[PDB]
Amino acid sequence: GSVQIVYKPVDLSKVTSKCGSLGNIHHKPGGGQVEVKSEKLDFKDRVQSKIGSLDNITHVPGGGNKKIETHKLTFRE
Amino acid sequence: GSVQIVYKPVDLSKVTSKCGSLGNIHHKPGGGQVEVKSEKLDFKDRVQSKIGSLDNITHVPGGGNKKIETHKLTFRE
Amino acid sequence: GSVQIVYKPVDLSKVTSKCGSLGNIHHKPGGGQVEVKSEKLDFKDRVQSKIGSLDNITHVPGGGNKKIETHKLTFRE
Amino acid sequence: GSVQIVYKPVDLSKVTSKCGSLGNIHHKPGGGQVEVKSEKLDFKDRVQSKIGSLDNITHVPGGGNKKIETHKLTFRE
Amino acid sequence: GSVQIVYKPVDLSKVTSKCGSLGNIHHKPGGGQVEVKSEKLDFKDRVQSKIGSLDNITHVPGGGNKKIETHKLTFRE
Amino acid sequence: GSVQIVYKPVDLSKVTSKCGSLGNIHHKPGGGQVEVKSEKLDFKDRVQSKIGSLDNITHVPGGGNKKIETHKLTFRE
Amino acid sequence: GSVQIVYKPVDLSKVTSKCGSLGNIHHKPGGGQVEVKSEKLDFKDRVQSKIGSLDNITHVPGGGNKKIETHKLTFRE
Amino acid sequence: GSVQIVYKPVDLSKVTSKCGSLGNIHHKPGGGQVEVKSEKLDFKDRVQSKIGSLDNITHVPGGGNKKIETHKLTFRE
Amino acid sequence: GSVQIVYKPVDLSKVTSKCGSLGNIHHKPGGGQVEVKSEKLDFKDRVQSKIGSLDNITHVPGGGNKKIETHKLTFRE
Amino acid sequence: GSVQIVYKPVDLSKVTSKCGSLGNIHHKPGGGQVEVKSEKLDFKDRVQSKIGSLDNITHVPGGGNKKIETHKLTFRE
Incomplete structure (x- = not known):
């Protein structure tokens, strides 16, 4: 028996945005304190650990559309 | 017996936005205190752990549409 | 016996928004205190743990439509 | 039996953005304190660990559309 | 039995952006303090560790579209 | 007329204390938030004002007797 | 008329204390947030003002007797 | 008329203390955030003002007796 | 009339202390954030002002008796 | 009239201390952030101002008795 498979998806989507003005942004973190304690750490696979962090991120993309x-x-x- | 499969989805969607003005944003975190304690940590798979964090994020995308x-x-x- | 399958979905949806002005936003967290205690941690699968966190997020997208x-x-x- | 497979997807998508003006951004982190303690660390796979960090990131892309x-x-x- | 496979995807996507003016950005980190302690470290695979860091990044691309x-x-x- | 005044108070008081062991004390305040608003402030005398404070005190004197x-x-x- | 005044107070007081062991004290404040607002401030005398403070004090005197x-x-x- | 005044106070007081062992003290403040606003400040006398401070003090005197x-x-x- | 004044105070006080061992002290401040704003400052007298400070003091005197x-x-x- | 004044105070006070061992002291400040703003500053007297400071002091005197x-x-x- 013959098997025929046709896979023809079509996309014409659009993801747009507009912004006349974008600014005047303030980000002022006031410190902190972090303490961690451990003994054994065994990571054997697709592991994405993150231990004991104090982070500040300011992400201001003018666009930022994701598909x-x-x-x-x-x-x- | 013959098997025929046709897969022709069609998309014309649009995801838009508009913003005349965007700004004057203040983000002022007042510190903190974090303490963790552990002995054994065995992660063996698609693990995405995150232990003992003090984070501040300011995310202001002018667009930000996701599909x-x-x-x-x-x-x- | 022959089997025929046709899969032709169609989409023309739109997800829009408008905002004349967007701003004057204040986010002022007043600290905190977190303490955790553990002994054994075995994560072996698609695990997405998150232990002992003190986080502040300011998310102000001008658009923000999700499909x-x-x-x-x-x-x- | 003969097997025929046709794979002809089509894309015409667009991901655009516009911003008249983008600026006046301030990011002033006020220090911090991080302390970690461990004994054994065995990572044998596609591991992406990150231990004991104090980071500040200012990411302001004029575009920033991702596909x-x-x-x-x-x-x- | 003969097997025929045709793989002809087509792409005409575009990822664009525009920004009239982009600037006046300040990034002033106020120091910090990091201390880590460990005994044994065995990494034998595609490992991407990062231990005990105090980093500041200012990333301001005029474009920044990723495909x-x-x-x-x-x-x- | 002659006036004679004699002022001879006598004190032999003692104020003592004893403590075999004194310790193991924990003081962990969890942040807070204070906001004050004023226009005019006229202090002209032996004034001891204190406005808008967030304070933590740990006072553990081994003695602490006051006379x-x-x-x-x-x-x- | 003759006036005679004699002022001969006597003190033999003692203020003592004892402590066999004194320690193991923890003081961990978790941040905070303070905001004050004013226009005019006129202090003309023995004034001891204190405005808008976030303070932490650890006072552990081995003695601490006051007379x-x-x-x-x-x-x- | 003759006036005679005799002023002969006597003191033999003692202020002592003892401490066998004194230590193991931890003081870990977790940051903070302070903001003050003013226009006019007129101090003309024995003034001891203190405006907008974030202070940490660790005072551990082995003695500390005050007379x-x-x-x-x-x-x- | 003759005036006679005799001023013969006597002091034999002692202020002592003892400490067998004194140490193991940790002082770890976690940053902070201070902002002040003013226009006019007129100090004309014995003024002892102090504006906009972020201070840490570790005062560990082995003696510390004050008279x-x-x-x-x-x-x- | 004759006036006679005799001023013969006597002091034999002692201020002593003892400490068998004094040490093992850690002082680790984690940064900070200070910002001040002013226009006019007129100080005309015995003024002792101090504006916009970020200071750390470690004062460990073996004696430290003050008279x-x-x-x-x-x-x-």
């Missing part, structure tokens, strides 16, 4: 698209075709016999 | 689209076709025999 | 769309076609024999 | 697209075709016999 | 696209075709017998 | 003694003799004619 | 003694003799005619 | 003694004799005619 | 003694004799005619 | 003694004799006619 994610995944296609998957699995054929088995 | 996610996944297609999956699994064929078995 | 999620998933298609799945499973064929078995 | 991710993955295609996968697995054939088995 | 990622991966194609994979696995054939088995 | 106050005042003598006053006023003669008028 | 205050004042003598005053006023003669008028 | 204050004032004598005053005012004669008028 | 204050003032004598005053005012004669008028 | 203050003032004598004043004012004669008027």
Whole structure:
């Protein structure tokens, strides 16, 4: 028996934005205190650990539009 | 027996936004105190741990529209 | 016996927004105190743990429209 | 039996943005204090650890639009 | 049995941005204090560790649009 | 007329204390938030004002015995 | 008329203390937030003002015994 | 008329203390945030002002006994 | 008329202390943030102002006994 | 009329201390952030101002006993 598979998705999407003016932003963190304690650490896989951090991030993108698209075709016999 | 499969999705979506003016934003964190205690840590898989953190984030995207689209076709025999 | 499957979804959706002016935002956290205690931690799978955190987030997107769309076609024999 | 597979996805998407003016941004972190303690650390896989950090990031991209697209075709016999 | 596979994806996407003026940015970190303690460190794989850091980053790209696209075709017998 | 005044107070008081062991004391304040608003402030005398404060005090004296003694003799004619 | 005044106070007081062991004291303040607002401030005398403070004090004197003694003799005619 | 005044106070006081061991003291302040606003400040006298402070003090005197003694004799005619 | 004044105070006080061992003291301040604003400042007298400070003091005197003694004799005619 | 004044105070006070061992002291300040703003500053007297400071002091005197003694004799006619 013959098997025919056609996979023709179509996309014409648009992701736009507009901003006349963007600014005057203040970010003033006032310190902190962090203390961690451990003995053994065994990470053996796709691990993404993060231990004992004091971080400040200022992320101001003028655009910032994100589009994610995944296609998957699995054929088995 | 013959098997025919046609996969033709169509998209014309739009995700837009507008903002005349965007600003005058203040973010003032007043410190803090964090303490953690542990002995053994075994992470063996797709682990995304995060231990003992004091973080401040200011995220001001002028746009910020997000679109996610996944297609999956699994064929078995 | 022949099997025919046609998969032709259609989308023309729109997700829009408008904002004449957006601003004058204040975020002032007054500190805090966090303490955690543990002995053993075994995470072996798609784990997304988060232990002992003191976080402040200011998220002010001018747009911020989110669209999620998933298609799945499973064929078995 | 003959097997025919056609994989012809089409994309015409656009991800745009506009910003008349973008600036006047202040980021003033006020110090901090971090202390970590450990004995054994065994990482044997695709590990992405990060231990004991005090970081400040100012990320102001004029654009900042991100597009991710993955295609996968697995054939088995 | 003959097997025919055609893989002809097409892309015409565009990722653009515009910014009339971009500047007047201040980033003034106020010091800090970090202390770490360890005994044994065994990393034998694709490890990306980072221990005991005090970092400041100012990333202001005029553009900053990122596009990622991966194609994979696995054939088995 | 002759006036004779004799002022011979006598003190032999003792103020003692004993403590075999004194310790293991924890004081962990969890932040706070204070806001004050005023226009005019006129202090012209022995004034001891204190406005808008967030204070923490740990006072652990091993002794701490206090003795106050005042003598006053006023003669008028 | 003759006036005779004798002022012979006597003190033999003692203020003592004892402490076998004194320690193991923890003082961990968790930040805070203070904001004050004013226009005019006129202090013309023995003024001891204190405005807008965030203070932490750890006072652990091994002794700490205080003795205050004042003598005053006023003669008028 | 003759006036005779004798002023012979006597003191033999003692202020002592003892401490076998004194230590193991921790003082860990977790940051903070202070903001003050003013226009006019007129201080013309024995003024001891203190405006907008974030202070930490660790005062551990092994002794710390304080003695204050004032004598005053005012004669008028 | 003859006036005779005798001023013969006597002091034999002692202020002592003892400490077998004194140490193991930790003082770890976690940063902070201070901001002050003013226009006019007129100080014309014995003024002791202090504006906009972020201070840390560790005062560990092995002794630290303080004695204050003032004598005053005012004669008028 | 004859006036006779005798001023013969006597002091034999002692201010002592003892410390068998004194040490192991840690002082680790974690940065900070200070900002001041002013226009006019007129100081015309015994002024002791101090504006906009970030200071750390470690004062560990082995002795540290302080004695203050003032004598004043004012004669008027």
